[PDB]
Amino acid sequence: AAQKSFRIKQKMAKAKKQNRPLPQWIRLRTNNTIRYNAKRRNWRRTKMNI
Amino acid sequence: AKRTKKVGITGKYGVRYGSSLRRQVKKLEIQQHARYDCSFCGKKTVKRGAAGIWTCSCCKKTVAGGAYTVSTAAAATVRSTIRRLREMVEA
Amino acid sequence: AREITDIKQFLELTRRADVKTATVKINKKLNKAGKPFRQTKFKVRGSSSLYTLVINDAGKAKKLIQSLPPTLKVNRL
Amino acid sequence: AQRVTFRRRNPYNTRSNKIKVVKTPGGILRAQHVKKLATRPKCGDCGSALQGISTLRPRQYATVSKTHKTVSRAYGGSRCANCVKERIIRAFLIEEQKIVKKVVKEQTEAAK
Amino acid sequence: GRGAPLAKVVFRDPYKYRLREEIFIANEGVHTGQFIYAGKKASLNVGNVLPLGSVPEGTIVSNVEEKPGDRGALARASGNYVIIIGHNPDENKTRVRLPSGAKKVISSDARGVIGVIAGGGRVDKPLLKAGRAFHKYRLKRNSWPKTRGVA
Amino acid sequence: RLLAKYRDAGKIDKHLYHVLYKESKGNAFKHKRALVEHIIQAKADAQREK
RNA sequence: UGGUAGUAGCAAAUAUUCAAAUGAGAACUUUGAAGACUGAAGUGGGGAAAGGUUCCACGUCAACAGCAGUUGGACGUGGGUUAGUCGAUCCUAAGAGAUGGGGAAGCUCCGUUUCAAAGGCCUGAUUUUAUGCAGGCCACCAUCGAAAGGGAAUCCGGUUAAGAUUCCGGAACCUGGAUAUGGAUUCUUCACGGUAACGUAACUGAAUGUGGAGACGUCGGCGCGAGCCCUGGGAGGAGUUAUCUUUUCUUCUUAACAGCUUAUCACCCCGGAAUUGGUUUAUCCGGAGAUGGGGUCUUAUGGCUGGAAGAGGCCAGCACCUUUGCUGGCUCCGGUGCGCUUGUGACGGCCCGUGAAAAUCCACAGGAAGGAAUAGUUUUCAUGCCAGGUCGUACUGAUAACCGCAGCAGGUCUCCAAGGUGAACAGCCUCUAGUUGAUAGAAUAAUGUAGAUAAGGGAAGUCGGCAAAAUAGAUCCGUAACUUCGGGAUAAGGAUUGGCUCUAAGGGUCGGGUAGUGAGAGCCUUGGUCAGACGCAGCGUUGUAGACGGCCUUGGUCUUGCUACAAUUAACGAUCAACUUAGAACUGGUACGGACAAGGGGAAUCUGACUGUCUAAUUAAAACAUAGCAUUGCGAUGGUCAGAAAGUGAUG
């Protein structure tokens, strides 16, 4: 941490690209129940445990 | 002067440890920290480290000896026994 | 990184076919305690180190500037 | 004063991580990491450092010419001179004394 | 962790050209540069190592083998020694006296080095403080301090 | 080093050097001036015994 | 979902104020002006562990920031981490763990060099031979395990909204591989010099062996070096000026690398010692050869030069809607040290503690093999050429970025380190740096918490002087019983302590002559000789300076050979930095360790000898430990103990 292996950084890359809200166009789509993103992992609330 | 009356070097221990024990440790530190004659170079330069080891300061030698003195009294007789025993092989 | 005292060694270096760049630097320093005078430094770039030549008397320096081969690219100051 | 920092990423005061403080041409104090000090080669027999040998770290000795690693005697960069002198004297005199051991037993074995 | 000092005696390998270094327990009074003679016909001087069938009785040897070739079992700690008190040349046995005062008959092909063991009189000095016993037992094993089982 | 340079100037011989050196190793000399006075004292004594 | 209740409360960390800007709206945002704080064992600069985007920018104010909000470690959208040299990679440590084997119904257990036929290395065979075969050797015997141990290699300056020992400019070095050009050697084929210690840019060398480096505790003082601190002269810029002050602050810097040179230590040669002598703060050395004289060596260091002033720094001018500068200067000469920190050299103390290993690299012994000159050898000499892969790199490292459910007065390893007082890294105040954040306003009742101060008496309070008070720094005097003779002891108990003007002591560096002479190895100067050259200036012109100087000199030009006189005596004269100690007057509303800091002591008893250790969240003790004493078992086909077993295991 500040000096890392590669595997942990690869999972941080995935944890970055998932840390975003819904696309705005899905809420218009037919038969939609998804109203927000129920998996927003912040860094002040949830530690991902690698 | 003579700064201590009867403790000597064991005055570094102080008031602790009894009197007979400090007298007993004195008896062996006067042998241990002393400076002995080297039998080969003839110089009084033998000091010890590392109990049982007597390194000459000059002359590079090292005598494995007694732990506090260069050759203890129960050892220096043994070689005289050897001096008795090796003479009977020839005569 | 090196310093050269000889002149003919420097002339041997300027024709060594790796030396593509040289430069002439003109310093303004003072002799023994009194007077300002003109020092020059000839720096040839060998491919490993940068050789120099320190000339204090400029009466050798004008002859030496003339004595450089003209195929050598010279940065003047 | 100007308080300085480590340059590498090792924060502890180990034997590898030593620091000199140097003024740099920008005027500022800055740290310089200093390699451990090289030790002189020693005689294997008398323990004295033997002279004529450049004192370098052990992989520096492959960057150097052979005359900074050697003196011009037999047993040059390995043993100090006196010991070499002694192992000539001894190695002469016994190989004279042994010849005495070959001249006594030509006569004592013959006069028996 | 050992009261006696060692002795790194170096021998010539008889079958390949090299030197083999061997760690004896130093007897008392072996200066460095002493030639140490291992073997049957070796003379009887302080530091030589000999078979027990080659020495006379009353000889004060140490580092003596139990069975011939286990390389130094009996009488190794500092100050100690065994004393050959008799021979039995029939079926080549030797009767010795161990440091505890137990007499014992062993084989006369076992090897003992002549002389008492260097470092003698090590426990005649008091160990005055607890820290000195700590620094004694930090180099042997974890057997200190001993809590009483009544406590 | 004052005894050293007085010997190197030849003002004092080496016998009195080896006496006054071991005396200076004790107290025997409160300062520089007392030692100069003690040099001149013993030198005048050996001069009167000459 | 209530009553409770719009109450308990949002009070530790000395602390905020004024004006302007944005805005619907500023106790809280931004700038400026004040005022303070941490005060360099910092509320400062970097990091390890940990977090993972929080770093940085634009926009937004629903929710969160237990008040506020136009602000944010929030929300929305994007941007950002560049390495041959930093680390990981490689090595082994305590240890883990295959293979061979041995158990176990089996999951799996033991063991790690072991009851195992456990593999590669260079030369020859080549011109079927592709690189197999004929040998000569050698035997170690997996693998993992330390981004704090071992280790091949870099630094400076600049640069971005966020990266830099990584990018850019310059300057280097290491490893691996190629081949040439020189130089060296050679018909004395595989170098010479030095009495020697050893030196030279080079100066064959296999298998095998040996040695060195890697390789190393801790404490103490001494020497040297670096950086900081302090200080003098000089060259700039700012502040103060009612008065005074040659004033107060600030800038004046130099890297990696390379060449030459040098300091202890060590060694060689001549030489010979007692009328014992060298010599350290610390007492060790010398006929196993001192002191003395002359040398050799190492180079962390230091110095000079190159890098490199063309860099950075501090100023000045001419300007410039803006872009962007351009032109100039200077950047110099020193000194001190029980100073602070740090590195090291030689020592000295300590031990029934004597204080890692391997990789890697080098050297020597050895002599296989190969090599001459019409030229073969030489890449551990100079130069040149080519290449250096992968992964990490942003930021915080904490009274908001980690863990404690939280933006929790807790907890978490380390480096740097300023001025004054002062013994001090104590407390107290300031500089560089960073903050000004911890809901506010008004009053200031009871009872609280935190700090105080009290007439007279003095523990009479109380289970008990519990809590406070009192002493306390330094200097000088004086110090009992008892004792293991070391202590007890800062025992007890007294006396001083400012400011000012002085006095005495405590140290260094060079000079030890007059006269006649040589070189005054300064040669000045008058004269030139011709390198009299660089460069300036002007319409090769034919003017400028000759660097105002190698070279030749008629001498007035404070270092001296040789002797004269006789040189020698008291040992001096000049001169410069340190502070320490002792005393005297004089003076102050009798004060003066003026704040801070900072022992109460004695007479005894019970108990444990002591230093130490534990019930982390009620027990820190007379308990546990301890050294000391004593006992018991055991001679390894063993004593104590483990295992479900084993061709097992701990002490070992």
Side-chain angles (χ1 to χ4, degrees):
Chain A
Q3 198 171 9
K4 302 188 284 287
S5 65
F6 179 73
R7 187 182 295 275
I8 318 297
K9 187 180 187 293
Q10 192 183 6
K11 293 179 72 67
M12 297 172 202
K14 186 176 177 70
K16 179 182 177 182
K17 287 187 281 189
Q18 288 178 352
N19 194 2
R20 70 175 296 274
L22 294 183
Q24 293 291 321
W25 55 270
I26 299 173
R27 294 173 62 89
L28 281 79
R29 192 177 66 188
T30 302
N31 297 118
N32 197 3
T33 188
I34 299 168
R35 294 182 183 179
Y36 64 98
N37 192 3
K39 296 178 187 178
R40 289 298 305 275
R41 192 268 316 162
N42 199 6
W43 62 276
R44 297 180 70 81
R45 294 192 293 270
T46 300
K47 307 299 177 184
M48 71 182 78
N49 301 115
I50 310 168
Chain B
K2 181 174 71 175
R3 298 180 295 273
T4 56
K5 186 176 180 180
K6 68 176 73 175
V7 288
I9 180 167
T10 188
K12 69 174 183 177
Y13 292 147
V15 191
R16 279 84 53 88
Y17 305 143
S19 65
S20 297
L21 292 184
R22 287 185 288 115
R23 183 175 64 244
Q24 191 58 256
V25 175
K26 178 187 178 183
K27 181 181 182 293
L28 288 172
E29 287 186 357
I30 294 170
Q31 288 178 354
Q32 171 181 357
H33 296 162
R35 185 183 292 271
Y36 290 91
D37 293 330
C38 188
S39 296
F40 302 106
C41 64
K43 298 174 185 178
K44 191 183 290 294
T45 57
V46 169
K47 293 180 70 66
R48 67 184 287 280
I53 292 175
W54 291 87
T55 65
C56 186
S57 297
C58 68
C59 190
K60 305 294 186 293
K61 291 288 185 182
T62 308
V63 176
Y68 298 137
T69 186
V70 171
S71 183
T72 184
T77 179
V78 174
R79 67 188 68 185
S80 68
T81 303
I82 302 302
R83 184 65 178 170
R84 184 180 61 83
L85 290 171
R86 194 176 66 249
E87 294 292 327
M88 294 188 290
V89 179
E90 293 87 4
Chain C
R2 291 184 180 177
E3 183 189 2
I4 294 170
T5 62
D6 194 2
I7 296 97
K8 189 175 184 292
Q9 184 178 1
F10 181 78
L11 295 176
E12 288 181 355
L13 296 188
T14 54
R15 294 185 297 273
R16 204 182 68 191
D18 56 346
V19 177
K20 294 174 71 175
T21 57
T23 186
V24 178
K25 181 66 175 67
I26 302 300
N27 293 322
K28 183 173 67 67
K29 291 190 186 294
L30 53 91
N31 60 6
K32 304 296 292 296
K35 290 183 180 180
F37 74 101
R38 183 175 179 268
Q39 186 190 8
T40 184
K41 288 182 177 179
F42 297 103
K43 305 169 191 177
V44 286
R45 183 57 179 164
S47 295
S48 68
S49 66
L50 178 69
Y51 298 96
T52 194
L53 177 58
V54 173
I55 300 299
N56 290 316
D57 186 76
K60 291 179 69 67
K62 187 181 179 181
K63 274 77 176 176
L64 198 146
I65 292 168
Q66 186 62 254
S67 296
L68 262 71
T71 61
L72 183 61
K73 293 183 184 294
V74 178
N75 193 2
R76 187 172 294 113
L77 278 74
Chain D
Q2 299 179 359
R3 291 173 296 175
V4 76
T5 62
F6 281 122
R7 288 183 62 83
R8 297 174 182 172
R9 202 186 283 272
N10 185 358
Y12 303 104
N13 193 2
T14 66
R15 286 189 289 122
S16 63
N17 205 3
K18 291 190 285 183
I19 286 298
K20 180 170 67 179
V21 183
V22 183
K23 295 175 76 68
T24 60
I28 57 172
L29 290 177
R30 185 173 287 180
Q32 171 172 353
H33 289 279
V34 176
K35 301 175 181 65
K36 300 197 290 184
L37 270 74
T39 62
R40 305 186 70 186
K42 305 291 189 292
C43 181
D45 195 1
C46 71
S48 295
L50 48 89
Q51 62 180 355
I53 315 297
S54 293
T55 70
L56 295 173
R57 303 298 291 163
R59 202 172 173 182
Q60 299 290 315
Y61 285 104
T63 64
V64 189
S65 176
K66 194 176 185 292
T67 60
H68 297 90
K69 298 183 284 183
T70 310
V71 308
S72 295
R73 284 178 286 110
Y75 296 93
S78 179
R79 309 301 176 98
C80 64
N82 288 320
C83 292
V84 175
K85 172 179 177 180
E86 289 177 353
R87 67 177 63 190
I88 293 170
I89 302 296
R90 186 182 295 117
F92 176 74
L93 289 175
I94 301 177
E95 287 189 353
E96 188 71 27
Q97 182 63 257
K98 191 185 290 181
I99 305 300
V100 177
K101 301 293 183 182
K102 269 76 176 174
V103 78
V104 173
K105 298 293 178 67
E106 289 180 353
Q107 295 178 357
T108 305
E109 294 177 353
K112 186 182 287 184
Chain E
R2 189 187 296 269
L6 294 174
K8 290 178 178 291
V9 180
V10 61
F11 292 97
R12 288 175 64 246
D13 185 75
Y15 307 114
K16 189 183 176 181
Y17 174 67
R18 63 183 177 180
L19 281 76
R20 289 188 292 114
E21 188 177 7
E22 288 175 352
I23 298 170
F24 291 170
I25 290 173
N27 281 327
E28 186 163 358
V30 286
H31 60 276
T32 67
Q34 180 178 358
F35 292 157
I36 294 301
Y37 295 96
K40 185 176 75 175
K41 290 182 182 179
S43 66
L44 195 144
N45 295 114
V46 179
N48 289 317
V49 41
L50 284 80
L52 271 69
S54 297
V55 296
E57 69 180 1
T59 304
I60 302 169
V61 311
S62 70
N63 205 2
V64 51
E65 293 181 353
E66 291 175 349
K67 294 179 288 295
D70 64 348
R71 300 171 66 185
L74 303 169
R76 300 174 77 187
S78 67
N80 287 310
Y81 55 90
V82 305
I83 292 170
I84 293 96
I85 65 171
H87 292 285
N88 192 358
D90 294 332
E91 65 185 0
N92 61 14
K93 298 292 180 68
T94 305
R95 189 173 180 178
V96 300
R97 180 180 293 167
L98 288 170
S100 65
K103 297 183 287 294
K104 187 183 181 181
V105 47
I106 56 173
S107 179
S108 297
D109 292 332
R111 291 170 290 166
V113 63
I114 310 295
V116 302
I117 297 167
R122 184 177 59 85
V123 292
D124 293 334
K125 187 178 177 180
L127 195 64
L128 293 186
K129 59 181 183 179
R132 191 172 291 176
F134 180 79
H135 288 291
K136 178 183 177 180
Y137 287 114
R138 60 173 289 172
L139 265 70
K140 289 184 167 66
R141 84 297 319 276
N142 195 7
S143 69
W144 195 80
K146 295 180 181 65
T147 309
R148 294 176 295 122
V150 179
Chain F
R1 64 180 166 86
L2 184 142
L3 268 73
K5 74 178 182 180
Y6 279 175
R7 185 189 62 190
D8 288 332
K11 296 172 74 70
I12 183 173
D13 52 350
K14 67 181 181 180
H15 295 82
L16 193 62
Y17 176 78
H18 191 70
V19 173
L20 296 177
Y21 183 79
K22 296 177 76 69
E23 291 186 356
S24 299
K25 184 173 173 61
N27 278 319
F29 296 108
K30 188 175 183 290
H31 43 81
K32 174 183 182 293
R33 181 183 66 191
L35 189 140
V36 174
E37 291 178 354
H38 189 275
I39 288 176
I40 297 163
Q41 182 62 253
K43 187 175 184 292
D45 290 331
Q47 185 178 2
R48 289 191 295 271
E49 293 293 327
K50 187 182 290 292

